[PDB]
Design a protein around this nucleic acid. Structure first.
Ligand SMILES: [Mg+2]
Ligand SMILES: [Mg+2]
Ligand SMILES: [Mg+2]
Ligand SMILES: [Mg+2]
Ligand SMILES: [Mg+2]
Ligand SMILES: [Mg+2]
Ligand SMILES: [Mg+2]
Ligand SMILES: [Mg+2]
Ligand SMILES: [Mg+2]
Ligand SMILES: [Mg+2]
Ligand SMILES: [Mg+2]
Ligand SMILES: [Mg+2]
Ligand SMILES: [Mg+2]
Ligand SMILES: [Mg+2]
Ligand SMILES: [Mg+2]
Ligand SMILES: [Mg+2]
Ligand SMILES: [Mg+2]
Lengths: 185, 205, 132, 291, 177
RNA sequence: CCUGCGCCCGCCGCCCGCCCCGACCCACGUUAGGGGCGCUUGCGCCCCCAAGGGCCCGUGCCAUUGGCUAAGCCGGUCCG
RNA sequence: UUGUGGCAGCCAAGCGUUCAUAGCGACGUUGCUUUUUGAUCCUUCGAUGUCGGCUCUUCCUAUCAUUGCGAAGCAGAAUUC
RNA sequence: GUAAGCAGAACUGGCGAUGCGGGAUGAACCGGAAGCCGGGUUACGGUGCCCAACUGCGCGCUAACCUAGAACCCACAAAGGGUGUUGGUCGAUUAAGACAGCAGGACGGUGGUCAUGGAAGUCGAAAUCCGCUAAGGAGUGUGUAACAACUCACCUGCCGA
């Protein structure tokens, strides 16, 4: 019912944004990230020659005006993933049994052993942009890094929900792999 | 809905991004009115309400079967062309001689088989998704529903369409060249004839 | 970006009703659905946006002009003759004229295009054979 | 009116109708999914069940009580003389399914395989393929046969060979009319498959070139026929008490009052045996090659 | 054209009795779809407010009120009393229309839409032309903006007349806002 | 494979029966966008609304007696 | 029809060694169900074979065990919602 | 009578005894009562298809991952909930800096107190003033058996709508 709702974001000058129909492709020193926004029913327009991306909702409701800042928030993550990148961190938390994390191939997967003394072996591959590396400096860490904040976050979540403790009171058997520092490097 | 009133031998309709119920209702009255209809690209028919609602609706349909003899029971078709035909049959009196004759005039296909690929394919504005659905309301494709309820010819229809669409695009380009040289001919002839074409100037666009 | 807006001074075709084919000037918008439209031949009245079509022409006015000021600004931007000679506004005019051909006129046009049709084909044959 | 005590249903609803098979030769209702990097092999044969006997072998299976022990096992012998490939068939993917595109036959077909096409061989003229044979002796005819091969290579998505058995080499079978089937070629491209099949026309395939030792195979065929059988043997339902009027060997209640119909799930009397069956994972213990 | 509703002055008084040869005269401004329904609603309020029934009363004059400047846009406020499914309420509204008749027609429509309230359940207390700079509702205020500009996000695709209706068309409709 | 006195195919001699009455027309894709054309390959130009268009001797009693005939167009037939 | 039979809700005085709501839930109150019985007498008295078991099939969920989960006065084992 | 398509009364009408149009279907619900026909127009009810009649012109509300919902009688749904969404009513805070979020911050007569084996406030906890100030209850849990700081309402710093 609101005639016009719009928000603007600035675009750093070491990256270039190429919005087509609603395909916002972003390119910079680290790589290229693309995302589909055809589902939004908004109006995207670069102004000042690519240095601002101004997004528009005509006659939207509260639900539809909620999309403006999500798209704006998403495009930030596409910007910052292509300059600095993203890096999640997970600690190994265990009471008695050490968990033996081992890489699969060229930092593209992990293979976690002995979790709660189980003989079963846990297999999880990294998504396209994500590499995994055991921390050289901290007691029990694995460090995930990549361009796409979402692919990095799903990989972090994959490894966490593959170490769920079953059958036992989880207020005491705290064992698992959890996200420690979720910042952007 | 009364009927087109057209004298075509048949009308080929490209059902892509039409609404199943609205398209079926238009087509049904045409068949009753004695017209013959070909409907192609039924895998591309759209249905309002998302896939989840439409899957649930279809699996309630699978439950209906004659308990003592399921082969006699309702016959659940998976292919989109047969989904379209039964939806149309629902809108026709099909247990009369007149309705049997109406259903005979209908042919429905997945994709665009010969000879209908080199034929002009009409669209029905009363059932188009752009005009009947508000952008931001869930919908699915009738091809998508069939894939998830047991139609095992989705991929072959996809393989065939890519080869056809490529084969049609070079024809687009071939006519594109032929259109341009004909246009330059238009000028070159229309300067050869001067005042002799004066009667056409006020009725041209 | 879009290329046509509902706003002050925008001239819009009336594309449905008994009044089909007239240019009006949006002089104030009442709500999200209804406009107030004034043209120099008619009484300023409110109309729905569903019965209009925004054109490409604009004139440089205030909100709610005076009829004399409206009549002036229409001519200063030359609203009528621009609509009449552009392809969109000429399609309307010809489609009226084609309707008004009597039977003898339709015959002499029928003669003209047969002669023109021959010209094109023999013109088009010479290009088709000249180019290889 | 719930049943007082429960027990699982007698018989399987998955093998209905329990009618006589429409086929004497077993039908391959699915071939192994193709793996284009494999070399061109065949996927099936036609054998003849000769009989049974038993072996005694010694097991290696650490953790089993049979480990380092003997065991006695029944085995079945299937006589499998070489197949003879007489033809090639190509298939193409259509929106309705798979379709035969074309087919090329060998020049020379034995009397046995040609008997397959007649219902009274002896009083016929034996003309089958007598004119298709002449396509191999004129350059215009050879041109067609070669052109048909090109068409298979050009469009086929699946290639099958036509093969017949050498029924005459089993004198115990009082049969001269060979059995004929289509056997799919897996592996290689379609160009590889067509070359593999045609190259090898009129020739013999041993069982070695397809099956190996200790591999698992499915066996397809029609079971023994037992005529018209009542519910106790046909379906396995229990007998009724001795003192029943009008007979023991039946099903007491064939349905409730409603629905007012007999359901397809209730056990009835009818044909028993001579049914089509596919039976999986029959292991191969020994291949016997003459010589 | 016709407005569905019309504004009326209705004038009336009690019957002259053997005392009070000059009973007191009352007036209202009423909304109805014709004079007959206007007179009927007058005798509704005057029975329940001033305790004079139509039987013991007398009708003096009835006049229709028209808009002075139909060609301009006025803002409007309407103070209305209505009945819900579980009681009675007071509600205030803002509307934009060129005539106050048009303003009232929208009000009944939005009551039947947003609240399922029917016309026999609404009593209009007070009507006014609230000049802008004092309009309260947010919907009405966003239109108090010279340089108003917006696209047409919804646009009907339809022939000028049904004469040009077809069932089939060669190409898809071509739309852009 | 295709009936030894049985059938099949091809040409013209047509006569019925049948349908029809100009029984003319292939882009994909989306619609908070797209299309044609040039040159930075992106920018300019022009066009965007309905096949509401184009095409076609479209004009001879389903069509007068004969001859002639360019260029152009449509059919049958030959071959590729 | 739903008194009675069976299942389920809401409020929360209290229990739960302290803590209304882990698990319960008094005094009150709202429903559902139609395997009980009662109430009724609409159908059938020129007849619809009237208990139970045996046999066989199918259907429901208001889920006992089996699969996947959530909570706990869940340390584990067991148990409960 | 808990009730019942239950039993018994009062006024009127209907069915029974009556076809016809509508409510998909129905004895009594809505319209309307009738010779055999032509033409016109209506009532109830309708106008996407079935199915005669608009995919008509307008304005809002609804998005159902429960079979969304959709016909007087009529083929139910209740108490009770929702930070789904849309409108209103009564109050409030706001540039004198509001709400959120983050916190250095909650200090002094003051453990005069309240437990004579414990508590400006911190197992616990009767309760009323005052000192400072843009300011902070002689503190319901900030958790230290006990003077230590972040997490309440009460003011400050950060934020600027
Ligand atoms: Mg109709
Ligand atoms: Mg029983
Ligand atoms: Mg049981
Ligand atoms: Mg047995
Ligand atoms: Mg006996
Ligand atoms: Mg009860
Ligand atoms: Mg009870
Ligand atoms: Mg009785
Ligand atoms: Mg009885
Ligand atoms: Mg009886
Ligand atoms: Mg009897
Ligand atoms: Mg009887
Ligand atoms: Mg009986
Ligand atoms: Mg359940
Ligand atoms: Mg009687
Ligand atoms: Mg009549
Ligand atoms: Mg609400």
């Amino acid at each position: 019912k609101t005639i016009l709702a719009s928000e603007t974001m600035e675009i750093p000058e070491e990256v270039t944004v190429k919005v087509s129909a609603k395909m916002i492709s972003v390119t910079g020193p680290r790589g290229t990230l693309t995302r589909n926004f055809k589902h939004l029913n908004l109006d995207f327009q670069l102004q000042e020659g690519g240095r601002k991306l101004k997004v528009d909702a005509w006659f939207g409701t509260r639900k539809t005006m909620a999309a403006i800042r999500t798209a704006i928030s998403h495009v930030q993550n596409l910007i910052t993933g292509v300059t600095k990148g993203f890096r999640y961190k997970m600690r190994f938390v265990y009471a008695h049994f050490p968990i033996n994390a081992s890489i699969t191939a060229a930092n593209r997967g992990i293979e976690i052993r002995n979790f709660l003394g189980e003989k079963k072996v846990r297999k999880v591959d990294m998504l396209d942009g994500v590499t995994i590396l055991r921390s050289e400096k901290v007691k029990d860490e694995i460090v995930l890094d990549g361009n796409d904040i979402e692919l990095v976050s799903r990989s972090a979540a994959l490894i966490n929900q593959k170490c769920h403790v079953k059958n036992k009171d989880i207020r005491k058997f705290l064992d698992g792999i959890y996200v420690s520092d979720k910042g952007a490097i | 809905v009364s009927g087109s009133g057209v004298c075509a031998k048949r009308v080929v309709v490209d059902a892509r991004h039409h609404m199943l119920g609205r398209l079926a209702s238009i087509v049904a009255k045409e068949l009753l009115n004695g017209q013959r209809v070909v409907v192609v690209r039924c895998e591309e028919i759209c249905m309002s309400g998302g896939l989840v609602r439409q899957k649930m609706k279809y699996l309630r349909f699978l439950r209906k079967r004659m308990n003592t003899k399921p082969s006699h029971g309702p016959i659940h078709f998976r292919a989109p062309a047969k989904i379209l035909w039964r939806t149309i049959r629902g809108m026709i009196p099909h247990k009369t001689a007149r309705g049997e004759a109406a259903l005979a005039r209908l042919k429905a296909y997945e994709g665009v088989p010969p000879p209908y690929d080199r034929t002009k394919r009409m669209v029905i504005p009363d059932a188009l998704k752009v005009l009947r659905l508000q952008p931001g309301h869930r919908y699915c494709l009738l091809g998508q529903l069939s894939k998830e309820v047991g139609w095992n010819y989705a991929d072959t229809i996809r393989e065939l369409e890519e080869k056809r669409k490529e084969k049609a695009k070079v024809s687009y380009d071939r006519r594109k060249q032929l259109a341009k040289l004909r246009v330059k001919a238009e000028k070159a002839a229309e300067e050869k004839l001067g005042t002799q074409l004066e009667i056409l100037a006020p009725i041209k666009y | 970006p879009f290329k046509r807006f509902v706003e002050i001074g925008r001239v819009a075709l009336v594309n449905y009703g008994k009044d089909y084919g007239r240019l009006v000037v949006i002089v104030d918008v009442v709500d999200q659905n209804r406009a107030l439209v004034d043209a120099p031949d008619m009484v300023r009245c409110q109309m729905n946006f569903k019965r209009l079509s925004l054109t490409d022409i604009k004139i440089d006015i205030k909100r709610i002009p005076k009829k004399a000021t409206l009549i002036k600004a229409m001519e200063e931007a030359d609203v009528k003759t621009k609509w009449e000679n552009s392809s969109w506004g000429k399609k309307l005019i010809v489609q009226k004229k084609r309707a008004a051909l009597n039977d003898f006129d339709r015959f002499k046009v029928m003669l003209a295009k047969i002669k023109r049709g021959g010209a094109i084909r023999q013109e088009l044959a010479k290009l088709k054979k000249e180019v290889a | 009116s719930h049943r007082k005590f429960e027990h699982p249903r007698h018989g399987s609803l998955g093998f209905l109708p329990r009618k006589r098979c429409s086929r004497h030769r077993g039908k391959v209702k699915s071939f192994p999914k193709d793996d284009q990097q494999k070399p061109c092999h065949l996927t099936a044969f036609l054998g003849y069940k000769a009989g049974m006997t038993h072996i005694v072998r010694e097991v290696e299976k650490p953790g089993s009580k049979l480990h380092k022990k003997e065991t006695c096992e029944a085995v079945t012998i299937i006589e499998t003389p070489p197949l003879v490939i007489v033809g090639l068939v190509a298939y193409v993917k259509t929106p309705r399914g798979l379709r035969t595109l074309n087919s090329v036959w060998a020049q020379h077909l034995s009397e046995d395989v040609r008997r397959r096409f007649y219902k009274n061989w002896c009083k016929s003229k034996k003309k089958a393929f007598t004119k298709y044979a002449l396509k191999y002796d004129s350059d215009s005819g050879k041109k067609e046969i070669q052109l048909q091969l090109e068409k298979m290579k050009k469009y086929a998505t699946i290639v099958r060979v036509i093969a017949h058995t050498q029924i005459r080499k089993m004198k115990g079978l009082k049969q001269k009319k060979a059995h004929l089937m289509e056997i799919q070629i897996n592996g290689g491209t379609i160009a590889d498959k067509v070359d593999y099949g045609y190259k090898f026309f009129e020739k013999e395939v041993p069982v070695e070139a397809v099956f190996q030792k200790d591999e698992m195979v499915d066996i397809i065929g029609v079971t023994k026929g037992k005529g018209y059988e009542g519910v106790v043997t046909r379906w396995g339902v229990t007998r009724l008490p001795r003192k029943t009027h009008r007979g023991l060997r039946k099903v007491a209640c064939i349905g409730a009052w409603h629905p007012a119909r007999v359901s397809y799930t209730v056990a009835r009397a009818g044909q028993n045996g001579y049914h089509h069956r596919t039976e999986m994972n029959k292991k191969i213990y020994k291949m016997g090659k003459s010589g | 054209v016709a407005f569905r509703f019309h504004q009326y002055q209705v004038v009336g008084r009690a019957l002259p009795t053997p005392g009070d040869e000059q009973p007191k005269i009352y007036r209202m401004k009423l909304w109805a779809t014709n004079e007959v329904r206007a007179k009927s609603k007058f005798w509704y309020f005057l029975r329940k407010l001033k305790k004079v029934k139509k039987s013991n009363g007398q009708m003096l004059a009835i006049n229709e009120i028209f808009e002075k400047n139909p060609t301009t846009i006025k803002n409007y406020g309407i103070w209305l009393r209505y009945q819900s499914r579980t009681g009675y309420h007071n509600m205030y509204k803002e509307y934009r229309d060129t005539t106050l008749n048009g303003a009232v027609e929208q009000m009944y429509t939005e009551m039947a839409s947003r609240h399922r309230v029917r016309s026999p359940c609404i009593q209009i207390i007070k009507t006014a032309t609230v000049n802008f700079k004092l309009c309260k509702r947010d919907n009405t205020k966003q239109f108090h903006n010279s340089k108003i500009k917006f696209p047409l996000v919804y646009q009907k695709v339809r022939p000028p007349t049904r004469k040009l209706k077809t069932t089939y068309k060669a190409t898809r409709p071509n739309l852009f806002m």
